[PDB]
Symmetry: C3
Subunit: 63 residues, 3 copies
Amino acid sequence: INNGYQSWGPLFGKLFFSFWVIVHLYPFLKGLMGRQNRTPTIVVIWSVLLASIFSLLWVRIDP
Amino acid sequence: ARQPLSRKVPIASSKINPYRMVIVARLLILAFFLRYRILNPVHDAIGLWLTSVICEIWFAFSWILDQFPKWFPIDRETYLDRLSLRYEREGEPNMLAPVDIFVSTVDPMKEPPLVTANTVLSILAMDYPVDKISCYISDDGASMLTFESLSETAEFARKWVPFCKKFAIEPRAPEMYFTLKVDYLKDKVQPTFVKERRAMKREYEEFKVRINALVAKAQKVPPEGWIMQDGTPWPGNNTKDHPGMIQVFLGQSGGHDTEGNELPRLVYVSREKRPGFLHHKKAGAMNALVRVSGVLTNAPFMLNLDCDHYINNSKAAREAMCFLMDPQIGRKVCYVQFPQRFDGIDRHDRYANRNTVFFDINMKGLDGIQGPVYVGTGCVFRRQALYGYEPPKGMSQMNFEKKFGQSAIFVTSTLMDQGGVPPSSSPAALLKEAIHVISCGYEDKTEWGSELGWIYGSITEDILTGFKMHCRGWRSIYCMPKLPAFKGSAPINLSDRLNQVLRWALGSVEIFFSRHCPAWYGLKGAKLRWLERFAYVNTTIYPFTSLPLLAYCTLPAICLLTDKFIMPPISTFASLFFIALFLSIFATGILELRWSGVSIEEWWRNEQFWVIGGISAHLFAVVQGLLKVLAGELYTFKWTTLLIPPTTVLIINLVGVVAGISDAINNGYQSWGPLFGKLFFSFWVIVHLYPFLKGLMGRQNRTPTIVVIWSVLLASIFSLLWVRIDP
Amino acid sequence: AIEPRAPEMYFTLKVDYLKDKVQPTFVKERRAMKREYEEFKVRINALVAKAQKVPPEGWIMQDGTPWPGNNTKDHPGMIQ
Ligand SMILES: OC[C@H]1O[C@@H](O[C@H]2[C@H](O)[C@@H](O)[C@H](O)O[C@@H]2CO)[C@H](O)[C@@H](O)[C@@H]1O
Ligand SMILES: OC[C@H]1O[C@@H](O[C@H]2[C@H](O)[C@@H](O)[C@H](O)O[C@@H]2CO)[C@H](O)[C@@H](O)[C@@H]1O
């Protein structure tokens, strides 16, 4: 968000590394916390995404 | 020797105080946000703002009404060992209090005889002193099919009961025992169990064949009329005109079983129904049963059941006597209520059949105040409470004759404090007078149905029946056995589900319109605690919340099509409380599921079914209620026509989303800000509305189909393209 | 009045088999016929196993004269 395309390059590799770690870590927790197939629930994951969005908004307004 | 036979354990203090604190914080935040909405106008367009603020006021009031009576939830656990030690102590005659069980059968054409026979067999094979139970079956239709089915069941019971008693069977119902996937030798130890079980399965199959043959024979009506075995024709030939008729099976006069222990009595009743008098669908039959029992065999307590509901745990009555027989904490209890558990439900809850939130949160947390509300079936009442008498410890015959009947024998039978029968003793007088008690003009100059027994309401009479006695000084009590006490069949398809919610909502609406309304019934005199009044008001005015809801479902899209504003936006002041409201609600839900034990999936199933069923049938029930009231088509509607308001709302919201996308196309970043909230509101509405329609229209998991949804998206894209080219 | 009238496709139905049957003797005779069908299956499986091994000189009929179908590509017409 702070980037103005001039720094759009280097962070791609860091995003890739963090994404590799997250993809390795996440499915086991998905299986543990959810008794249903695919996604555990629906509205709870949606609200977790909502809370993350509002938290990053509050982080941005107070950098 | 002096222990209580039950104990009320409060929920753990560590797992409840944060819940209460979050409730208080949410109250404060909601009040402040509501003040902010009231203070701030809009000026640009006040109509939408006024509609939205009114909807949110009504939602806040409904939230208060629903959430306040959840303070101090409790659980109860019982000690059957002390009960058996102090009442069933060896060397003396057994002193457990007797009961009668009431099964009401309407018409075999919708309730197969096998289902009713399963309930009768489960009742007969109960664990309790045999000389202290009796079953009363009220056949409304006076049909002979149920009569012959009971004659068959009274013959199969002589084999089913001793085998069930010896080996301690879990369900004690034949079809629900021989159709268990679990292994049937998990804990059985008797050497002869296998051979006798394999000998009894064949007998049950032969009984099924006999019942199927009886149904087939009864399927064809004869011209002149039905014929009884003796010779005289069946008195129920004319369904709308037949005399009263009662018969007795399996009693002391009837033969013993295989071992030699006589069976519990099974009396079949059918009240006379002359044409030209008002007959009530279910309260009348129960009142007739209550009045017959007083003459035949009087019992302090009585249990009631539906045909489809059988007895799973064999000690349910024995587990209710620990509550109803203690002189200490049971002297002022009017009934014991069990939760409704259903069998055959799928792992996925297609349309909220499990009802976890109600029976697990609301009634468990309402047990702390005068006990729960009387649902339909599965509840043990105290006889002396139905007569209208207040709880104890703080010439003439004419007032008794006004109060209930002009039958001297039954009036005398009611004056006995606990049990016992009038000193006539001779069966001739009792069996000749119990047919007089079910006459068609008995409840005329009396108080039956208006102050005693089951209240003659409109469509549903259970809630009024419970509330009439809660309005006095009576308590009720809730019970959750580890092994479910009563399990019942579940509705098959969604059409019956929608008809069912319509019937419940209409019953509540009509309750909200009589002198028995919880809002202002018996304000003076008190005897009813305020929290119970709030609970009854919630249970009464729940359908009306669907009136503002529709408006609040459409208002976002309404502003999205043109105005695209609801309130002026200020990030410094409003945003903090706006986020805090959702945070408080989420914390409330988390702490609900912390102590309730309700799964996340069931929680959201109920949460979305709130709106889904509210916008489908509750506004309809309101339309019937108001139309009928103003009167002073009408019958059940088609299943399809019930679901057109939610579809219309979802279509309008999707069109609004498309219009917002078109505006974003027209937007040049200068207007990229304000529409985010409107998109969020419309998205909330769409997410609430959509999954039920997904489940309905698709028979496959996840997405219904593939190419059809893809082509719907394609058509939407081309439609928005044509809208853009012609703005 | 059986629905499929084929043994393997009748005794392998998940649906309940007493839905509309009314005759008193149905259960015993059905449970007596299932065993006969199983024994017939055993006999067929035995015949297949015996026929799986080809003899050198050729097949033999019960009466005595050999089976005319020993040479699959040259055999006279035969009806029974
Ligand atoms: O805790 C869920 C609870 O929500 C109630 O309505 C909420 C909901 O957030 C929304 O309808 C409105 O904006 O706010 C109210 C305030 O709680 C709903 O009425 C309850 O049935 C439900 O249990
Ligand atoms: O469960 C039987 C009982 O249901 C009542 O409707 C409930 C409904 O089950 C629940 O999901 C909702 O939250 O509350 C309503 C109001 O109690 C119905 O009103 C009764 O007539 C019925 O006996």
